[PDB]
Amino acid sequence: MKPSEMRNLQATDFAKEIDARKKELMELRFQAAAGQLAQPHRVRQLRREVAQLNTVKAELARKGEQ
RNA sequence: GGUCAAGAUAGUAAGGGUCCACGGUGGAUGCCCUGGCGCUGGAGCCGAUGAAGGACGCGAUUACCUGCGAAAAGCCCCGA
């Protein structure tokens, strides 16, 4: 989610922890339009995760090279 | 009482007038402020690591605005 158990992983996993959510974030987005989205928040969350799932990855891009 | 004659005179308002009562219209007036004006002082550059100012977007529902910008009404960190 954010702690040292987020970065904890592989760069590729970051992607996996990305390209998988936006796979949920889709089926969700579909549901909505199809009517049944009972997890309005899920959306916002899943989303918020992807944010972190990059901000971090991005924090590395400078720590270990400057 | 009456009839006849001669006189005189009022009343009704279709509509109007003045005044009062009560209303409608309309926004003056008074009180108020979520908005302005001036002077004093403070502060005084921004931009190819891409401005100024904008287009299209982001929301469970979003047309206007606001904040942002696909990491999209927000993401990390430090403090409070």
Side-chain angles (χ1 to χ4, degrees):
Chain A
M1 75 162 94
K2 48 190 172 189
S4 290
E5 306 188 74
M6 172 131 92
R7 49 73 173 183
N8 233 41
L9 293 159
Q10 304 283 296
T12 45
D13 275 284
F14 264 24
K16 163 197 173 187
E17 300 297 276
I18 293 181
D19 98 293
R21 275 47 175 298
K22 294 195 293 183
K23 167 205 178 83
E24 194 183 296
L25 196 52
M26 170 187 112
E27 290 304 318
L28 274 287
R29 188 153 37 61
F30 268 22
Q31 291 195 40
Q36 192 51 281
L37 185 191
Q39 307 192 296
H41 68 184
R42 187 59 193 174
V43 184
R44 313 175 297 167
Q45 173 204 282
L46 301 164
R47 304 249 301 178
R48 168 167 303 184
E49 270 180 37
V50 180
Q52 310 189 303
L53 301 160
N54 295 301
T55 335
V56 180
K57 185 187 156 205
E59 302 183 307
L60 299 190
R62 289 186 164 297
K63 297 307 302 180
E65 163 165 44
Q66 293 179 56

